[PDB]
Amino acid sequence: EKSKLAKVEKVLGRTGSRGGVIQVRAQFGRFLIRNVKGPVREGDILALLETEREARRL
Amino acid sequence: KLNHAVFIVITPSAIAEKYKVNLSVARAVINHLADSQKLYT
């Protein structure tokens, strides 16, 4: 429920069989490789809830 | 259903909600008070 700010460093690869999702690297200030559903660029800040649990790279 | 009547912080909707009335009647009431969307205090 408590949202934690993660500034996006680099946008890795556009995942999902249908293409809606992106893989993203985000610094709080630790490297957490996460998924995003919608337009995201470098420098934009995510709304992470369940912080310490990552995604699979491409 | 809600058959509102005619014979017996200001906006028409509010009036309708409160005394159970047609909004023409609400409008009339507003006019009286004063004496196409509305706002009154």
């Binding site: - | 058959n3 005619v6 014979f7």
Partner: protein, 128 residues
């Protein structure tokens, strides 16, 4: 009088006069308005606050409007088939007239009448 009776079978409840009037089978909207004008009664008032005298007057007006100022071309049922006058027919009377017309058509064995009897269109429409 929340609930009223101007003619053979109406309701005419809480609605604003003209629309209440339109409940009758001279349900013209425009016609109703004209009638109101003829009467000289405020159309912003509701059906329940009307006097009985007023109602009577309205009824009278509705019956044979031709002799009143209200014009000729206007009138519901133009020449009345029965070779004579032009008059607004009103209420169940209208229905009766329609029925009579239908019967006449049937008797004639005109195509339209036949169609009506069948329960098909009349208009010229398709419905394929």
């Amino acid at each position: 009088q929340h609930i009223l009776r101007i003619l053979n079978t109406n309701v005419d409840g809480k609605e604003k006069v003209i629309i209440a009037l339109t409940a009758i089978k001279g349900i013209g909207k425009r016609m109703a308005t004209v009638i109101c004008k003829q009467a000289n009664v405020d159309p912003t008032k509701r059906a329940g606050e009307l006097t009985t005298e007023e109602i009577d007057n309205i009824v009278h007006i509705m019956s044979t409007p031709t002799q009143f100022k209200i014009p000729d071309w206007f009138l519901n049922r133009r020449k009345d088939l029965k070779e004579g006058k032009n008059i607004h027919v009103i209420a169940n009377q209208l229905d009766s007239y329609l029925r009579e017309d239908l019967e006449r058509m049937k008797k004639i064995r005109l195509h339209r009448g036949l169609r009506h009897h069948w329960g098909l269109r009349v208009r010229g429409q398709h419905t394929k």
